[PDB]
Amino acid sequence: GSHSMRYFHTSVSRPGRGEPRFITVGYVDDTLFVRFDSDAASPREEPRAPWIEQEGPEYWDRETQICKAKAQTDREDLRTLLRYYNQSEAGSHTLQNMYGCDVGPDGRLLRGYHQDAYDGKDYIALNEDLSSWTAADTAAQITQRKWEAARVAEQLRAYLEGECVEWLRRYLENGKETLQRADPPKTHVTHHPISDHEATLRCWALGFYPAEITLTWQRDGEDQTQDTELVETRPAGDRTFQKWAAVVVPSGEEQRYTCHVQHEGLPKPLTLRWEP
């Protein structure tokens, strides 16, 4: 299958309440594996998956120094961005960075990413070519000129095509028991009377990994997208995810309705119905 690695970073300034808080996390696919929080006492990057724990002290030292450096760059960048947007020093602002790579079933690079946002909006992004930039506004154009002059994109390309892919391949092997296992949804349909005239049928998908899933209702083989309540996929807290889809049905018509479930972990897509 195809896989991804991402590092997410957020600094939030808090004028009059010390230096910004900095939090970064790393994921492979939908699995958190490392974390760093600047407000921890003597902060270190820490493992959050079993398969990364085997990395040696030199790995944790380098990671932690990278994280502390990123917090420091962010502090300077938050100051700079106040100037670029003609903002007062009184308010809290946010700086976000994501980077990483996608690989295919063969382990080859599919796409690399590096993008920044200020106050929840795009600032500057590396394009898919890993060679040119998209600046969101005239402020980010100042950054773009600075980063073009310094050949930043060339550095990112080298990381994203090389280490990002190589280390992701390493993690997928070391974590093969979990990262390369899809857990199918456990599914069932429940029935929730509204009145003597209608009831809700709710189709449940529980315990699945990764998070990607499709849940639909049909009535006599026709989709019911407009009349379906579909909740956002949500974490269970044990690596897995949950989702449900619900439709309101006239009393006595329940056997017309089928729920359809597609997920990577299932031997075959499911068709389920309410079973009194």
């Binding site: 790393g26 990278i66 760059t73 960048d77 960075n97 980077y99 600075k146 980063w147």
Partner: peptide
Amino acid sequence: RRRWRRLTV
């Protein structure tokens, strides 16, 4: 593993 960010905005 991560990369170092080197350049400020």
